[PDB]
Design a protein around this ligand. Structure first.
Ligand SMILES: CCCCCCCCCCCCCCCC(=O)O
Ligand SMILES: CCCCCCCCCCCCCCCC(=O)O
Ligand SMILES: CCCCCCCCCCCCCC(=O)O
Ligand SMILES: CCCCCCCCCCCCCC(=O)O
Lengths: 60, 254, 56, 266, 254, 266, 56
């Protein structure tokens, strides 16, 4: 977050594996893997997309 | 231990990290645990479901206006439609869980305000008309916030709950609501509030659709304010995580 | 000079000899893997552990 | 290779391995087991098909020059350099200072031309590909004195067999090859600026050894380099604009990436 | 061991007891087990659900006529709508289970007949028209039996499966279908047939809605018969139990 | 391996190794010495010419594609698969999940075409058979950029010598090859259903390297696979109806066996 | 690595060496015979001896 030092806010970050994609609402995305990040004083937050696949590899 | 004011919570699949926060208030002094085999009466075997049920389901948001009174939620019912916690809630018949309530509200250094984040066990309510009893669509929202008012209740509609904020709707003194676990949100020096609640109830395992365990109440004791030239929209959100879930009595859905 | 070394298995041996004078007639050093990431990621002076906060 | 994973349980402490500062130029070191609770799975993979030893040591085309058999100027020549093909150029420009050997290879070919004689019976042809380092004699025709090769290294090969191959040491002046040069060649800081200021590398000549025929044959050689023992230093970002000059870095500015019809569109 | 011909099976909540039966054929020689942590590639944690999923779900019944040809079912799809096995099948994304197939068909000592109870792994099929490929509503029923015919297929409807019983529909010799595990039902000396099948498949865990694991086929090689003066209705039923279930990859429903 | 036999004498007990029940899905285990009295003969045979290692490891034709030399589109290509010939297809469909290596081999041939020039003298030709994995560049003519093969594996072979041969590891995504697939490719359960949903395997390109001639030559390549280290699981009954589609299992129902003019006729 | 193994006689030895890095360049494992019939014939749970009657 690169805003002023008086700025504030929280955010959500979701990764929904494919059974049905592009969640329209926020409550549709909150069921998948997610994290909650709030800004200020070391603002930068790291979301870790894990590895969840049947096979061992994937195609570029 | 360096820079106390930063926490981090990774429960299952989600992770919520705050940089400016107060301490964490942990229930009545206990951490939520499973049910021992010395106090159980169920004759079946339980079902510790997964990491897929102990996650961070975020509910709806609302606007902190300059005249708003207060909101509340019912805990075992608000998570009825969220993911695999709402499927193992209706397919089964029994269950016991604990939660990890969270709250976010962030403003600049030019705003002011306060809030009382508290959860009350076994929260009753009072109908508007004295004879009748409250409705259900006026007592619990479908994961959407219910809000107090300033005028008391009126005399309608013979089933509406009485939204008298200064009495809390339960029939007690609002200033005495600091007995149950809680935390304040002062925008001067605070940005969130965490609360860990165990399972408190008479019987070992109780239904989920017939009896609500807790109740989450939010009340701003000091209204928002700001001079001209600042963002006039301050929203609020809450993130809850079922902790140590269990179930029994498999049947058909409902 | 013959060396009996290992092979590349999924989860044996294989001989080898050199026949020339120079060193540019041998084969590539394919069977060599050495990693060190610290040079490019994390070049900072003070060491930072992921538990403690980043900046104070 | 890769590392395993570790089993994690629910936590409520103040560890916070997620929130950090990115101003310090430090890439994080968070693994998936830190931010969420996961299982324990031991990975059996291996980072082998990606090391620079295995990534670079494959042969590729560099330059194919042809030479007819018709006249006294049949021979053809080429000046050594590696920035003449797009495939092998960009596979070098992810580093700055390299060090390697090479294994040359020449896949020579032939073809006929129109003629008027009654019959034609062409015996096998031979070459005769020479190498002249910088600062040495030079041939001008296919019947010159320079083709004796008293000290120059040559290769003689008759058509029909396997192609010729040979090695080459780390022949240079500096302690490592330089793929990017920033500065001029004259001390007055005038004239030539690009990378070819420190690239001579010699020459390369080819020629038909047969006397003549009735076709007459036409031929095209094809070079193939294969860096053998590589060592790379100081990586850099790859290229984004096409190549347009052999000894420059001139380009035409383009968009950073293709476009989608929205910010939220999938 | 006394009176071999009697068995008894209590798996979870249901129990099926036969008095007149043959031996029990156990897969290719293995008992269904969980997935070790030496052959897994999923990075999440599995979910051994409950006893609530390893139960005896009984499917529909049918009439053994005097001209019927044969029925079949698709195993991972037939249990899609049954109890908490059909909820953890669609809420998740991966899974691996084994079954315990059962069959009931009882007649008096004045009837005659036979049947071939066999399960085929990776059962393909052939469309009626050669160019096209079969439909889906003509390949799998919603836990209702699909049946062969006597006439071959006709030329319709460019998507119907070819119900040629003597070729089995897969393109092989029907007499050679005794390689896969199986058991006969001879009404002279038999009353049921039990089969335990492990999980057989290339990858460790596979989807449930995109690829069907097995296929259960029933074919009477000798038609029913009876003299005048006996019950002319002989029905058939099948009872299946998922064994050692597991799941991964929680998402929303579908 | 085979086992011996044992000497039997007359018996009148209640052993009855003959009568059993076949409903239990259990093949009997009666030997000839149990049902009648026999001698003692020790067999010296050996079950060696029937194991899957010796039964499958023989080369067979798969696909022969030809490419003329006339125009700029002379080259020819082929998509990898093993269900294009009837002999080697049915030798796979007695199992379900296999695992093996391979040893390719290309028996290339040539032939002339009509022309009008006076004389003809064709030197030897060369190839140049390329392999493009899935998701990669592609050539469109016989003078393209893709033929450099900077990372693709190619084979160059001049006509007149022995044919080219090479090996191939177990290149797949799953833990074993799958010869039968039951299910679709889209999660919506619509569209493609057959076995080709999990079969890409790459491509295969071939081309003349010579410039041109006066014939001009025409050629036909022939592939040959040889599964080396086999492992088979889950056998199944062989095929009874002919093949009629490359990526389906569609058939035409036929009689189970040829017919005789009676039940008691020999 | 050379092994001196046996040959296929009707009823001697023969050397062998590997020359490559990978494992897909060796020859087939023809000289290997391992049998187990119990998986396909007799997959039943209770073991049945041929002397005792089949079903009681
Ligand atoms: C018949 C043998 C002839 C051998 C010819 C040797 C060729 C020398 C190759 C020079 C190295 C390649 C160029 C690297 C850096 C550059 O100059 O761009
Ligand atoms: C010049 C070298 C080229 C090597 C080409 C490799 C060929 C790969 C063979 C794929 C395996 C055969 C197919 C098995 C199962 C199927 O896809 O039907
Ligand atoms: C020109 C080499 C001929 C082939 C080699 C035959 C074996 C000779 C013995 C070689 C032993 C060298 C020492 C070593 O093992 O490294
Ligand atoms: C490239 C191999 C050259 C031919 C082999 C010559 C003999 C050299 C000694 C080999 C001994 C290896 C050990 C072994 O016997 O297995």
């Amino acid at each position: 977050f690169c805003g002023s030092a008086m700025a504030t806010g929280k955010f959500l970050l979701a990764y929904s594996p494919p059974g049905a994609g592009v969640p329209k609402n926020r409550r549709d995305a909150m069921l998948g893997t997610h994290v909650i990040w709030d800004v200020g004083l070391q603002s930068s937050c790291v979301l870790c997309v894990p590895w969840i696949s049947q096979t061992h590899y994937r195609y570029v | 231990g360096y820079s106390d004011r930063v926490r981090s919570i990774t429960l299952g699949n989600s992770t919520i990290t705050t940089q400016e926060c107060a301490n964490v208030v942990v229930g009545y002094g206990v951490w939520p645990e499973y049910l021992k085999d010395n106090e159980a009466t169920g004759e079946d075997q339980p079902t510790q479901p997964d990491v897929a049920t102990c996650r961070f389901y975020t509910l709806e948001s609302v606007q902190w206006m300059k005249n708003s009174a207060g909101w509340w939620w019912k805990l075992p019912d608000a998570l009825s439609q969220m993911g695999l916690f709402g499927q193992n809630m209706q397919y089964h018949y029994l269950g016991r869980t604990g939660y990890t309530i969270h709250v976010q509200c962030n403003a600049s250094k030019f705003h002011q305000g306060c809030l009382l984040v508290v959860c009350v066990p076994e929260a009753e309510m009072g109908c508007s008309n004295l004879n009748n009893t409250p409705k259900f669509a006026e007592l619990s929202g479908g994961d959407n916030a219910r809000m107090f008012t300033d005028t008391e209740v009126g005399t309608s509609n013979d089933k509406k709950v009485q939204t008298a904020v200064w009495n809390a709707g339960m029939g007690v003194g609002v200033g005495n609501l600091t007995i149950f676990p809680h935390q304040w949100i002062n925008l001067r020096t605070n940005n969130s509030a965490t609360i860990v609640m165990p399972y408190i109830n008479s019987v070992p395992m109780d239904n989920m659709y017939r009896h609500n365990n807790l109740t989450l109440m939010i009340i701003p004791f000091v209204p928002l304010n700001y001079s001209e030239g600042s963002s006039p929209y301050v929203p609020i959100t809450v993130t809850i995580a079922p902790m140590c879930a269990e179930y029994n009595g498999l049947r058909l859905a409902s | 000079g013959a060396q009996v070394s290992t092979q590349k298995t999924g989860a044996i041996h294989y001989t080898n000899i050199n026949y020339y004078k120079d060193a540019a007639s041998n084969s590539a050093n394919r069977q060599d893997f050495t990693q060190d990431p610290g040079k490019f990621t994390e070049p900072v002076k003070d060491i930072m552990i992921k538990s403690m906060p980043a900046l104070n | 290779r890769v590392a395993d994973t570790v089993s994690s349980k629910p936590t409520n402490s103040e560890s916070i391995p997620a929130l950090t500062a990115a101003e310090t130029g430090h890439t994080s070191q968070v693994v998936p087991s830190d931010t969420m609770q996961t299982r324990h799975v031991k990975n059996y993979h291996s980072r082998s098909e990606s090391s620079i030893e295995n990534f670079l040591c494959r042969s590729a085309c560099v330059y194919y020059a042809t030479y007819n058999n018709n006249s006294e100027k049949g021979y053809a020549e080429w000046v050594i350099n590696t920035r003449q093909v797009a495939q092998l150029l960009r596979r070098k420009l992810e580093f700055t200072y390299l060090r390697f050997d090479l294994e040359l290879t020449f896949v020579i070919t032939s073809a006929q031309e129109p003629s008027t004689a009654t019959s034609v019976d062409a015996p096998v042809q031979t070459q005769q590909i020479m190498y002249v380092p910088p600062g040495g004699p030079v041939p001008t025709k296919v019947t010159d004195y320079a083709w004796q090769t008293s000290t120059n290294p040559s290769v003689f090969w008759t058509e029909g067999n396997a192609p010729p191959r040979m090695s080459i040491p780390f022949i240079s002046i500096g302690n490592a090859y330089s793929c990017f040069y920033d500065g001029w060649t004259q001390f007055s800081r005038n004239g030539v600026y690009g990378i070819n200021t420190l690239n001579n590398m010699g020459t390369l000549y080819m020629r038909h050894v047969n006397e003549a025929g009735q076709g007459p044959i036409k031929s095209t050689v094809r070079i193939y380099f294969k860096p053998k023992h590589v060592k790379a230093w100081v990586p850099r970002p790859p290229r984004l604009c096409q190549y347009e000059k052999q000894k420059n870095v001139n380009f035409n500015p383009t968009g950073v990436t293709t476009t989608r019809s929205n910010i939220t569109t999938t």
